[PDB]
């Protein structure tokens, strides 16, 4: 493991071996590499185009250094994110419904793009986003939900923060987020921002020891189930990767108006999610439904995508109360109540 | 000028416009860009593959920020198989019939650098810019130690050393002569550079600059076989191929041109001047021949070769006048001693 040799290899557009990539990431995350070289390597990786072995190597390096809690039966709804449309944080809302039927270990962070990270939307809801591992295990047991803040559960990652921020461009670390859940959740709905990443990440995921992880790419170009058109999907399990194409209509809905699903801040996301839970926003509620339906299919709790949607319908009607119990046990309900009062409670 | 927007553009493999690259280069050289971002930018440029505009832009940036003197009428020559540095010797011959503003640095590669050879010869390679033009006026020759005439490059040194790889800055040296010499003979290390650097040179305002790539891989005129060349002027770019045999000579065995020390390179050049090393003398003449064509002092390479033979017979004395005015002639006399 010699950083200069690795950089030369990358400059020459040669893919790294898994062990090679793992060792590289470890050194980087542990802060053993000069910032100048970390920057060069991240830029080189992206321009070469990261490979399956590199994603796998980096993913394992992060997991190895992460703080862990035990909940493999949990499901997560993390997505890679991406520089595109600023849609309402549906993965946070979907996570609330899911907690009604399965333990949820939500892995998230804050965002640079204004305030669009799941951590930001939950904080706006009144959730206390910093949960020490002992209490985290407690919360999931009592409410089937817990938020695992990346900046807290991946402490070594602060060693790459300055470079990542200064760079100001997406790198390999941005697509590894959902692959490094601190609770080691074996079930997951992972959103991706492109058709190629769909292929790259599913093959990477196949070697990452999941029970069932479904990756999706929403059509306009979203890392969520498409509200307007088709959703390209890949269902990976211990037996392979299933290709699945899908349209919003296969849920039983009519194309959802993108304008009604757009937000410009964490609180607007919070307000919209609550409005849907209150039955005041049919479109946002439908967006939550389709995303949750696929998540249920991942849990094998529904044999069909429309059955998932239908079941997700029962769930949303009991979601605000669930959100209320979640926040009260780990957060400030006063805030939640003002947000409720914000979109007419 | 937005650095982040520039980076995103390179990351997407889109070439920059000339003005864009020039402002980017200026900011970097001025040290106004965080090292993390300078590193990112150099790597992105390298992997995308630098374009003509990016070369032009960066070269104009270094020119603007360099310590300058003005001898546009002067000519500069080319410059690691370890072959003797004939571009330095050639610079000496040329100074007999035209002002020479030799731009160079020390080599990393064990003293093959023009600055190393000049030093071993007795020349004081560190020339203050004020004294620079006076030396050219009085002796028709002056060496411009790059490292000192491009002081602002200190602002990219740490990134360059830490990266350890070749970047856009490694091919700009000959396009940044501090004396603004309009005539130049510059070697490239690959045929792909011939095409790109010539198109870049075409827009760098030279009267006449000839780019050469010599077999088996040298940034000079080939002494063993072919030399792929491009002649750039206000009138366009001409493709020209040439074989050492055209100069009317037999291919020189490269083994007889390889040196492994600055002093050894100095000794071989002097022996050539003294008529004691015909193979080296030949290597010097064929290079001097193309430069002579660049100045339009001859109308053909053979003529340039024949002309160069007259010049070499007078180069030891010329070297002595040059050094006596800037350097130590006792060291030159030490080197002369048969050797």
Swiss-Prot record, chain A:
<keyword id="KW-0808">Transferase</keyword>
<dbReference type="GO" id="GO:0005829">
    <property type="term" value="C:cytosol"/>
</dbReference>
<feature type="binding site">
    <location>
        <position position="91"/>
    </location>
    <ligand>
        <name>Mg(2+) 1</name>
    </ligand>
</feature>
<comment type="subunit">
    <text>Homodimer.</text>
</comment>
<feature type="binding site">
    <location>
        <position position="164"/>
    </location>
    <ligand>
        <name>anthranilate 2</name>
    </ligand>
</feature>
<dbReference type="InterPro" id="IPR035902">
    <property type="entry name" value="Nuc_phospho_transferase"/>
</dbReference>
<keyword id="KW-0479">Metal-binding</keyword>
<feature type="binding site">
    <location>
        <position position="118"/>
    </location>
    <ligand>
        <name>5-phospho-alpha-D-ribose 1-diphosphate</name>
    </ligand>
</feature>
<dbReference type="GO" id="GO:0000287">
    <property type="term" value="F:magnesium ion binding"/>
</dbReference>
<comment type="pathway">
    <text>Amino-acid biosynthesis; L-tryptophan biosynthesis; L-tryptophan from chorismate: step 2/5.</text>
</comment>
<dbReference type="InterPro" id="IPR036320">
    <property type="entry name" value="Glycosyl_Trfase_fam3_N_dom_sf"/>
</dbReference>
<dbReference type="Pfam" id="PF02885">
    <property type="entry name" value="Glycos_trans_3N"/>
</dbReference>
<keyword id="KW-0328">Glycosyltransferase</keyword>
<feature type="binding site">
    <location>
        <position position="109"/>
    </location>
    <ligand>
        <name>anthranilate 1</name>
    </ligand>
</feature>
<feature type="binding site">
    <location>
        <position position="223"/>
    </location>
    <ligand>
        <name>Mg(2+) 2</name>
    </ligand>
</feature>
<comment type="similarity">
    <text>Belongs to the anthranilate phosphoribosyltransferase family.</text>
</comment>
<dbReference type="GO" id="GO:0000162">
    <property type="term" value="P:L-tryptophan biosynthetic process"/>
</dbReference>
<feature type="binding site">
    <location>
        <position position="87"/>
    </location>
    <ligand>
        <name>5-phospho-alpha-D-ribose 1-diphosphate</name>
    </ligand>
</feature>
<feature type="binding site">
    <location>
        <position position="224"/>
    </location>
    <ligand>
        <name>Mg(2+) 1</name>
    </ligand>
</feature>
<comment type="function">
    <text>Catalyzes the transfer of the phosphoribosyl group of 5-phosphorylribose-1-pyrophosphate (PRPP) to anthranilate to yield N-(5'-phosphoribosyl)-anthranilate (PRA).</text>
</comment>
<feature type="binding site">
    <location>
        <begin position="89"/>
        <end position="92"/>
    </location>
    <ligand>
        <name>5-phospho-alpha-D-ribose 1-diphosphate</name>
    </ligand>
</feature>
<keyword id="KW-0822">Tryptophan biosynthesis</keyword>
<dbReference type="InterPro" id="IPR000312">
    <property type="entry name" value="Glycosyl_Trfase_fam3"/>
</dbReference>
<feature type="binding site">
    <location>
        <begin position="106"/>
        <end position="114"/>
    </location>
    <ligand>
        <name>5-phospho-alpha-D-ribose 1-diphosphate</name>
    </ligand>
</feature>
<protein>
    <recommendedName>
        <fullName>Anthranilate phosphoribosyltransferase</fullName>
        <ecNumber>2.4.2.18</ecNumber>
    </recommendedName>
</protein>
<dbReference type="Pfam" id="PF00591">
    <property type="entry name" value="Glycos_transf_3"/>
</dbReference>
<feature type="binding site">
    <location>
        <position position="224"/>
    </location>
    <ligand>
        <name>Mg(2+) 2</name>
    </ligand>
</feature>
<feature type="binding site">
    <location>
        <begin position="82"/>
        <end position="83"/>
    </location>
    <ligand>
        <name>5-phospho-alpha-D-ribose 1-diphosphate</name>
    </ligand>
</feature>
<feature type="binding site">
    <location>
        <position position="79"/>
    </location>
    <ligand>
        <name>anthranilate 1</name>
    </ligand>
</feature>
<dbReference type="GO" id="GO:0004048">
    <property type="term" value="F:anthranilate phosphoribosyltransferase activity"/>
</dbReference>
<feature type="binding site">
    <location>
        <begin position="77"/>
        <end position="79"/>
    </location>
    <ligand>
        <name>5-phospho-alpha-D-ribose 1-diphosphate</name>
    </ligand>
</feature>
<dbReference type="InterPro" id="IPR017459">
    <property type="entry name" value="Glycosyl_Trfase_fam3_N_dom"/>
</dbReference>
<keyword id="KW-0028">Amino-acid biosynthesis</keyword>
<keyword id="KW-0057">Aromatic amino acid biosynthesis</keyword>
<keyword id="KW-0460">Magnesium</keyword>
<dbReference type="InterPro" id="IPR005940">
    <property type="entry name" value="Anthranilate_Pribosyl_Tfrase"/>
</dbReference>
């Amino acid at each position: 493991m010699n950083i200069n040799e690795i950089l030369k290899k990358l400059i020459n557009k040669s893919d790294l071996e898994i062990n090679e990539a793992e060792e590289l990431a470890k050194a980087i995350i542990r802060g053993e590499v000069p910032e100048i070289l970390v920057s060069a390597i991240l830029v080189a990786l992206r321009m070469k185009g990261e490979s399956k072995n590199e994603i796998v190597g980096f993913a394992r390096a992060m997991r190895e250094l992460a703080i862990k809690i035990d909940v493999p039966n949990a499901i997560d709804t993390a997505g890679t994110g991406g520089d595109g449309l600023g849609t309402v944080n549906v993965s946070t809302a979907s996570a609330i419904l899911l907690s009604l039927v399965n333990p949820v270990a939500k892995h998230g962070n804050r965002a640079v793009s204004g305030k669009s990270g799941s951590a930001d939307v939950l904080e706006a809801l009144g959730y206390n986003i910093i949960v020490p591992p002992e209490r985290a295990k407690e919360l999931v047991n009592k409410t089937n939900f817990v938020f695992l803040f990346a900046q807290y559960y991946h402490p070594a990652m602060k060693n790459v923060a300055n470079v990542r921020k200064t760079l100001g461009i997406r790198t390999i670390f941005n697509i590894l987020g959902p692959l490094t859940n601190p609770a080691n959740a074996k079930y997951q709905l992972m959103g991706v921002f492109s058709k190629d990443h769909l292929d790259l990440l599913s093959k990477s995921a196949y070697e990452l020891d999941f029970n069932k992880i479904i990756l999706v790419y929403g059509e306009p170009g979203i890392d969520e189930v498409s509200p307007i058109g088709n959703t390209f999907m890949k269902i990976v399990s211990k037996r392979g990767i299933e290709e699945v194409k899908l349209n919003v209509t296969d849920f039983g809905i009519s194309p959802i108006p993108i304008e009604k699903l757009i937000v410009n801040s964490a609180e607007d996301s919070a307000i919209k999610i609550v409005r849907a839970f209150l039955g005041k926003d049919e479109h946002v509620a439908e967006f939550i439904k389709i995303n949750t339906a696929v998540a249920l299919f991942a849990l094998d709790r529904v044999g069909d995508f429309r059955e998932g949607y239908e079941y997700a319908d029962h769930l949303i009607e009991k979601s605000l109360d669930k959100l209320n119990e979640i926040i009260s046990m780990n957060g400030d309900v006063t805030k939640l109540k003002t947000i409720v009062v914000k979109s007419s409670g």
